[PDB]
Write a protein that binds this ligand. Sequence first.
Ligand SMILES: C[C@H](O)[C@H](O)[C@H]1CNc2nc(N)[nH]c(=O)c2N1
Ligand SMILES: C[C@H](O)[C@H](O)[C@H]1CNc2nc(N)[nH]c(=O)c2N1
Ligand SMILES: [Fe+2]
Ligand SMILES: [Fe+2]
Lengths: 370, 370
Amino acid sequence: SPTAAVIAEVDELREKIKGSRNSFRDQSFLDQLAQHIADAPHLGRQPIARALVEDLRGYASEPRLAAVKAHINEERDQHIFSLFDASYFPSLSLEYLTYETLPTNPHLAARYASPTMPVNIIASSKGFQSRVVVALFPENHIDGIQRGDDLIFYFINKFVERHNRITRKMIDAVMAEGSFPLLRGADDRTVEQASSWWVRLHEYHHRQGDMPIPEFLRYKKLKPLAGLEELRVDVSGMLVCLNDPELPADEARLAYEYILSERLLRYAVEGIPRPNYDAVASQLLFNYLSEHGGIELHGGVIRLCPELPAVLTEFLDRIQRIEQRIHTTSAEEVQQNLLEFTNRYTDYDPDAKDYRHIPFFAEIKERLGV
Amino acid sequence: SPTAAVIAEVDELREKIKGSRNSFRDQSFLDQLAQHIADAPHLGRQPIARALVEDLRGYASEPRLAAVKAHINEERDQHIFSLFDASYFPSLSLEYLTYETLPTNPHLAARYASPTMPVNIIASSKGFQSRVVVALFPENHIDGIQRGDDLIFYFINKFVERHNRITRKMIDAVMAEGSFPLLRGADDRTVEQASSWWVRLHEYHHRQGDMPIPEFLRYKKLKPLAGLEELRVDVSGMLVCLNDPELPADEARLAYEYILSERLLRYAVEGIPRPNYDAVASQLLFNYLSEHGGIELHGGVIRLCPELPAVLTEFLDRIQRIEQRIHTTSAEEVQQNLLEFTNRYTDYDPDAKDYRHIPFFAEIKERLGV
Ligand SMILES: C[C@H](O)[C@H](O)[C@H]1CNc2nc(N)[nH]c(=O)c2N1
Ligand SMILES: C[C@H](O)[C@H](O)[C@H]1CNc2nc(N)[nH]c(=O)c2N1
Ligand SMILES: [Fe+2]
Ligand SMILES: [Fe+2]
């Protein structure tokens, strides 16, 4: 494969520079890296590799990857190639991938517009093969810059994999029979459609409300608050799927089931030994819905109440009431009120200043190995 | 097996009460549980079961499991049976195990004495079969009481299993050849002895110093501080193994290798997505040793320097200098100085107020699946 030879050349350069991350912005290093890319028989002739070499060679006077980002944002082709520094995606250094785009619903893309690219990875260098790397954000390039119109990529093939490995067996073990009928036996293309709706609604709603990100990002990185923000936007997305009549009814109900099953099950067991940010918020959701009549526990399995849409609306309204006071109080005062809400419905240890998995999901982690 | 019939009855009672944790101190519940234990054909005959029945029936007036713990602490036999509520061992409710004790060196047990019981589990009920449950502490019983002379149990078979499954693989993948020569190819009986030394020294040193636990426990539960306290005691234990000439030379060197390999490798990769308390402190140690000449990295392989004992002594001296100021400053002021030290050598995210695996161990987690 010509692409196979390109990626082989990238993986060898990646191996050569693995011990050199502290030099990734040093011009002596970048000049040498650029030359090695330029001289790579297959990689060096790719248009996107011409762009990266240009950006790297100019980095001492312009610390941006403007030519690379212009190629990517204009979708000149379906190749992504760059030098990365993303602390939460540590496997990424010099990396290359090819992707394929997915069908898009016109109303969804118009009404809930964002620069989001749900794609499948077709081929990729080693860094992009890590299970951790489920997306690619503009600030992940070494220049660390993001613009509101930069494209953001989500690797839907990885979310399909995670759904089939974790969520499906949790649905079987944890939900009352008939809870997610459209998901039952659904093929990978159906899960792919649902997941692509999820990411599109997710990115759109992050930018909405009284404390949108990135504006208030630095107030929403604390574990409980990062999770609660994730949950704000995904509950918004579930409600859009339930309420917006211009979305196709079959696809919308499927996306609803996908987002709800993921937030009620897969995200709820994330993290060992303590829950991660997603799981704290999913456990808040679980306990909130339990105590407010949205779900019921019978024989250890979750029944979705017919009233759930009303309770989800109550929940999102509650979060929005807390955030609305940003107009009369400080960001820090709002944070304390979001933490107080979170802690009412989660297992917070005040001496460790951290959370424990609630017993319901601790038992499921032990039973299912999730 | 007569013990298999006992455990089967316990496991059946455990299933019956799994939904009732909120009732575990309700006297109506306890009366019923006690009656069911008393009436168990095999279980109910056991001296320790009669002790628990008596404790449970008296709980409304004396919320203590005094009879059970007197049986256990006196080693009246080698059975442990109680009703547990340990937030970090969530699998434990009504549980039963039989154990066998392990050899101990006489000088070690006299000079570093503590109420510690390194044991192998012979048989156990389901709660104790969780890989999470590596030890049993007196406050893990429902009464929540610990006294300084209560026996503390460590399940050495589980530590042997973890050393075989994780540490051995990391030694081969990460360490320069000859790094841990006594541990290489060592059999389970040998790792058992080393791990037994580790736990005895660990418990002993937790009670030593200017900020021992449990006295200062509530200041040492924050993730970095909990890890640093683990590391303080295990570095103390390494140094005893190197320095105390009344310990047998071969066994002491083996224990040194065990404690060092565990803290340098296995504990360093603990926690997903973020390091847990152990891993934060182990990454502190890694970077401190790297920066101060105790270890060297060559193409991603760790060499242990001949000077490492002197650098370990410097590291422990530094912790003790920070803690000594408890005598002239508040425990909060000491906490802040222990955090400052930790953060110099770890990857602290100031906006998340939490830690990331340092790149060296993030890569090993990816490479080895640990
Ligand atoms: C809310 C929480 O911090 C979460 O990790 C955020 C972080 N920043 C983000 N930024 C963008 N563009 N899209 C996202 O989905 C998120 N997720
Ligand atoms: C120091 C840190 O909190 C660590 O987890 C402590 C906690 N309390 C403990 N208590 C006892 N008896 N033994 C131990 O090893 C520990 N570990
Ligand atoms: Fe998000
Ligand atoms: Fe400890």
